[PDB]
Amino acid sequence: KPVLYYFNGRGKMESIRWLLAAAGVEFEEVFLETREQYEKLLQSGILMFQQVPMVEIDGMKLVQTRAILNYIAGKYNLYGKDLKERALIDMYVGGTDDLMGFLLSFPFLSAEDKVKQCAFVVEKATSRYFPAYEKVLKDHGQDFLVGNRLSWADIHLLEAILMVEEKKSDALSGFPLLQAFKKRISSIPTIKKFLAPGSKRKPISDDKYVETVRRVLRMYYDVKP
Amino acid sequence: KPVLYYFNGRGKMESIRWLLAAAGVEFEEVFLETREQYEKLLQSGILMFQQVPMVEIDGMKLVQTRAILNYIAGKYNLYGKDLKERALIDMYVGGTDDLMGFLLSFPFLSAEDKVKQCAFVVEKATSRYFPAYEKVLKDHGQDFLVGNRLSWADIHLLEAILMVEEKKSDALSGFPLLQAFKKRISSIPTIKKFLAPGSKRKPISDDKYVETVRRVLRMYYDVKP
Numbered sequence A, B: 001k002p003v004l005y006y007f008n009g010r011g012k013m014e015s016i017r018w019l020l021a022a023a024g025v026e027f028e029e030v031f032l033e034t035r036e037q038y039e040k041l042l043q044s045g046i047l048m049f050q051q052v053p054m055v056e057i058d059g060m061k062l063v064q065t066r067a068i069l070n071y072i073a074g075k076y077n078l079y080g081k082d083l084k085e086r087a088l089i090d091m092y093v094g095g096t097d098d099l100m101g102f103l104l105s106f107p108f109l110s111a112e113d114k115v116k117q118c119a120f121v122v123e124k125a126t127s128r129y130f131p132a133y134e135k136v137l138k139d140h141g142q143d144f145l146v147g148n149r150l151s152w153a154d155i156h157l158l159e160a161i162l163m164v165e166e167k168k169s170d171a172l173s174g175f176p177l178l179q180a181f182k183k184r185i186s187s188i189p190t191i192k193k194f195l196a197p198g199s200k201r202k203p204i205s206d207d208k209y210v211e212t213v214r215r216v217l218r219m220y221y222d223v224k225p
């Protein structure tokens, strides 16, 4: 039912794909590949702020990545049981959202800047974020980040870890609880399926992605790290 | 009584001040002035990600601006009645959060870039955001953005409007419904008191704010537009 409008790549839409898959929800995708269809999309006025991601779900044309994620999380009970749990989930998700946010521009960076940005991301992961989540798991010694059950915070943390490992395969060295976490969460049926071949999970963005985005939107021609 | 940890200025903490005040909740503030004072915080490790804003409320050390705001909004019934309305509130707040986000670095910009950034913001406001919100009110024939009843989205839009008017006094020129909206929200007792002199509302950030930030966090020395 849900239709995700975006480019054929990760970008800001990937986390939405992750959350939907984790909830075992099947979705379709509409890839923007030409300046024509985009302008036609702006014509219809279905993009409230003239921006994508855009997701058609339950009779709504939702824009704003966080709005879309929040709704999917709440609808499929992955947002906790009370306001207090939701506050923890939002706090944890805020950390990983910042971490993955540093890699959003990577594809558009020059071969030179990519090296600097890459070192930056790894530094942030191992010195700021990983320690923080490692401490949370140890503080309560539970299998999940909150409510002793799977939540959006778990899914978002698993995605961030895999993205960091794509840059440094041994990034989890020195964080045994997170390493166990990674294994456990990956084993969950819906997630295991998304990680398996033939899923709608997108691969690391390449030059074809960078070009398509630059043509359709006519922006990000000079992304600075 | 919730305690807010940040610098003596707007920054990312201002919206939190707005939300608490609108809900009619008094709060205390703790301004960071010395680098050694910040290191003390890190020492106790109260800042999960070594960052501020940080708010102590209901026995929690919440970090991540959006996490804090989502909590305050839901706790004081300013987050809609159901998931659908919440989705609408998040989508709207996403827009004004982006708009105000463009003015976050302004204080650290140069006289050269400030004139550039100022034109960029007013441009985005009048051609992308204000038209969107103006349309919501007209097409739905409502006096409030969601559920035709005060919600966080209304409070976040009023703040954004006032920030744009500080840069261009006649920015709302051409948006009659937003001008009526501005008067309607400002007349709400709690908000009216926050706009009156003597409140906890912070002024536009000045050089003294910038110097302090750079002195405490030791960064943001080269902030490009």
Ligand SMILES: CCCCCCSC[C@H](NC(=O)CC[C@H]([NH3+])C(=O)O)C(=O)NCC(=O)O
Pocket: A011, A012, A050, A051, A052, A053, A063, A064, A065, A066, A104, A105, A108, A217, A219, A220, A223, B094, B098
């Ligand atoms: C650094 C390059 C990587 C950026 C990837 C592009 S995402 C596409 C971009 N959308 C946004 O920036 C949306 C921001 C919005 N706050 C959200 O979170 O959804 C867009 O449509 N932009 C068109 C526009 O702004 O007009």
Ligand SMILES: CCCCCCSC[C@H](NC(=O)CC[C@H]([NH3+])C(=O)O)C(=O)NCC(=O)O
Pocket: A094, A098, B011, B012, B050, B051, B052, B053, B063, B064, B065, B066, B104, B105, B108, B217, B220, B223
């Ligand atoms: C462009 C200049 C504008 C000034 C913004 C400063 S807010 C202070 C800054 N905090 C953040 O960036 C927090 C981001 C976090 N995602 C949130 O929204 O709360 C910090 O603690 N930084 C210290 C650090 O990152 O270690």
Ligand SMILES: [Zn+2]
Pocket: A170, A173
């Ligand atoms: Zn190694």
